[PDB]
């Protein structure tokens with residue numbers, strides 16, 4: 001298990017534009033294209049991202065390409081964030097993947113507002129963090145995923161993903 005396989009499981013893989021759980025246009029392995037309700041807009045963002053006229057359809061390789069970029073960006077976002085970096089560097093490799101997952105799903109910003117959970121984790125108070133993380137819109141809107149991510153953070157193992 002690793003970050004790539006972990007997110008591939010949580011996000012799935014779709015080669016045609018689709019709407020995510022929030023109703024926004026997305027493609028591939030959870031690559032958000034736009035918050036706009038315009039499909040044309042979304043198609044515009046897709047073509048720009050891929051470098052061709054896709055007509056809203058991409059290949060597997062193109063999808064995996066975007067995924068790599070997205071993961072890399074996520075990580076760099078964490079390291080560049082003052083709120084995040086210290087937590088990240090305090091963690092073991094498994095829990096680090098849990099935090100990348102969250103950023104990938106919700107943005108640096110969104111995650112940096114789990115301040116309290118962030119602090120407990122820094123302190124290695126796993127159970128408490130777990131409970132606090134669950135008191136969130138995140139958990140109530142996508143509970144199965146959120147549970148997987150939260151057990152990961154809490155235990156430091158890949159159990160939820162088996």
Ligand SMILES: [Cl-]
Pocket residue numbers: 049
């Ligand atoms: Cl892009």
Ligand SMILES: [Cl-]
Pocket residue numbers: 141142143144145146
């Ligand atoms: Cl879910």
